[PDB]
Design a binder for this molecule. Structure first.
Ligand SMILES: *[C@@H]1O[C@H](CO[C@@H]2O[C@@H](C)[C@@H](O)[C@@H](O)[C@@H]2O)[C@@H](O[C@@H]2O[C@H](CO)[C@@H](O[C@@H]3O[C@H](CO)[C@@H](O)[C@H](O)[C@@H]3O)[C@H](O)[C@H]2NC(C)=O)[C@H](O)[C@H]1NC(C)=O
Ligand SMILES: *[C@@H]1O[C@H](CO)[C@@H](O)[C@H](O)[C@H]1NC(C)=O
Ligand SMILES: [Ca+2]
Length: 354
């Protein structure tokens, strides 16, 4: 299967990866192409021996562990100088939870058609013109119910979301309501224990970036993956969307602390692996601001960009409850541990049409 442990024909331990996620294979293939030639016969023979299957129409090869890289077919987008992810200024500091109109333009609302009606029951965040990142618990066993995504939202109840501009008002453009072509749940998602709680939703058309709809950045470098545990305070943003729908009509945000994993391991009476982050708890109105499957976000140095960019470091997995009651620390998916899976899943499923 994709990413299974394997041994290369030359005896190195590795994982079953697409060629675009193996620095050494990609270099050999690129070097031959650049010279206007095929790879030598002995190397073609090595690749046949290294072949570990075909998953979602992509040939996979055993790649030595140290040579595994994020999928170059997707990294070319994320590293593009014109890929405008995590852009924010954004607002002047108020004590409460208010969010400036359009200031978190990646925020997504997941719509479900159930008891004859439809409701937003999860959140998520735009990561590209065709992909939304969310929790697997928002998607698993719900493929027939989960049917639309809403992007560019601020206040759910009003079709027009405006702010004062002088003696007049400036409104954000209309929201975008888009369908879902693919429900892409992590292969190792455990629905019983809630582990590897991550999923991608591929939109059924491209949603071009607009002033109020833009992607969030991902922790695509070693520095950013390492940063997840060094950040003291994160933004927990959303409409407080749970199985009971949104608790807030308007987008809100709180500054919530990263906690030691022991806080969650004690509260949930279960081991907390490195693939999870422990956040917040012990408050009445802060930890609860997030959406089920929504982002855990913070500004960071993204590649060589001058301005800090917002990066999604976590995904709301468990323990984020309704406001007004004392919360327990919340479990979040540690996004850095899944960027490899994200890039390979987006690559095999296509950035544009499938
Ligand atoms: C992208 O997806 C949208 C939204 O549709 C949703 O996602 C799709 C991938 C499918 O899973 C849909 O079942 C799901 O609703 C598509 O727009 C929607 O198209 C459908 C079907 O042509 C419309 O349904 C009809 O609605 C009428 C009017 O009430 C009924 O009479 C019909 O019997 C049927 O239910 C639906 O109204 C429409 N929704 C929106 C918001 O436009 C869109 O076609 C699709 N493709 C592209 C290229 O965007
Ligand atoms: C959903 O509402 C019910 C009924 O009040 C409550 O028991 C529950 O905790 C809510 N779920 C979440 C995740 O907050
Ligand atoms: Ca609105």
């Amino acid at each position: 299967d994709y990413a299974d442990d394997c041994t290369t024909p030359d005896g190195d331990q590795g994982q079953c990866m697409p060629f675009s996620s193996c620095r050494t294979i990609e270099e050999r293939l690129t070097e031959a192409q650049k010279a206007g030639q095929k790879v030598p016969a002995d190397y073609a023979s090595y690749l046949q021996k290294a072949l570990c299957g075909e998953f979602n129409g992509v040939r996979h090869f055993c790649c030595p562990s140290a040579n595994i890289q994020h999928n170059s077919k997707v990294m070319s987008l994320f590293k593009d100088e014109n890929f405008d992810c995590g852009n924010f200024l954004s607002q002047r500091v108020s004590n409460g939870y208010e969010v400036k109109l359009s200031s978190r333009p990646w925020m997504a609302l997941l719509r479900y058609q159930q008891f004859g009606e439809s409701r937003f029951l999860c959140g998520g965040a735009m990561i590209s013109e065709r992909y939304i990142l969310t929790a697997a618990h928002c998607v698993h066993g719900l493929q027939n119910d989960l049917y639309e995504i809403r992007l560019g939202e601020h206040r759910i109840s009003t079709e027009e979301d405006c702010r004062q501009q002088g003696r007049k008002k400036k409104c954000a453009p209309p929201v975008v309501n888009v369908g879902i072509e693919k429900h892409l749940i992590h292969e190792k998602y455990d629905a019983r224990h809630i582990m590897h709680d991550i999923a991608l939703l591929k939109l059924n058309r491209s949603v071009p970036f607009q002033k109020h709809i833009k992607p969030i950045c991902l922790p695509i470098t070693d520095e950013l993956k390492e940063k997840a545990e060094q950040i003291s305070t994160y933004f927990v943003t959303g409409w407080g969307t749970t199985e009971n729908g949104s608790s807030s009509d308007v987008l809100l945000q709180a500054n919530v602390p990263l906690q030691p994993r022991s806080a969650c391991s004690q509260a949930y009476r279960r081991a907390v692996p490195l693939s999870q982050l422990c956040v917040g708890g012990g408050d009445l109105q802060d930890s609860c601001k997030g959406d089920s499957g929504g982002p855990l976000q913070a500004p960071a140095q993204y590649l060589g960009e001058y301005a800090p960019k917002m990066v999604e470091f976590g995904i709301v997995s468990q323990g984020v409850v309704t406001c007004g009651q004392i919360s327990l620390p919340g479990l979040y998916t540690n996004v850095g541990e899944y960027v490899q899976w994200i890039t390979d899943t987006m690559a095999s499923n296509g950035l544009l049409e499938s």
